Amino acid sequence: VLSEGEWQLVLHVWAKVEADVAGHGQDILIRLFKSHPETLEKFDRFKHLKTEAEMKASEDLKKHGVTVLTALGAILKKKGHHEAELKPLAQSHATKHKIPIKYLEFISEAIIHVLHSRHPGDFGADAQGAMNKALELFRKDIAAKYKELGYQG
């Protein structure tokens, strides 16, 4: 469980992300695809993109980034009380997109990395820690669902 103090650290930096959601989302997905190119194979929509330049130039990829961070922000603001928002996400990701839990770990790291790059002042080690805990909580709850449906592994 995160403390109120840990949640305030998470939401404080998240408020800055919202000042440029598209930029953050585009950096996050690109970091993911480069660092773990198997994740890009899961997107029919983006697998024709080969270079970083190409990825940066894609408006559609930018759009999807926004969809991703908008959905995550709605979850984080619930400070753990996210059942209604996390359940349909788990379902689509398990049964339709077929995204293994390991990939959620990879994107979580991409998120931390980018937040470190863009907000060094408001993202010190305590904030980093807090954010890692919130993302673990997200995964843990997604995994429980996957298991119910028979997709944990």
x/- track of binding to ligand HEM for residues 51-80 (CB under 6 A): ----------------xx--xx--------
Q: Applying CB under 6 A, does 43 fall inside the site for ligand HEM?
A: yes
CA-to-CA distance for 104 and 142, rounded, in angstroms?
9
Cβ 14 to ligand HEM, closest distance in Å? 13
Q: Applying CB under 6 A, does 103 fall inside the site for ligand HEM?
A: yes
Q: Applying CB under 6 A, does 140 fall inside the site for ligand HEM?
A: no
CA distances (Å), origin 59, targets 29, 37, 48, 63, 136: 13, 20, 14, 6, 30
Q: By the 8 A CB rule, do 141 and 82 touch? A: yes
Contact with ligand HEM (CB under 6 A): which of 9, 61, 90, 107?
107
CA-closest candidate to residue 113, choices 41, 34, 51, 1:
34
Q: Applying CB under 6 A, does 102 fall inside the site for ligand HEM?
A: no
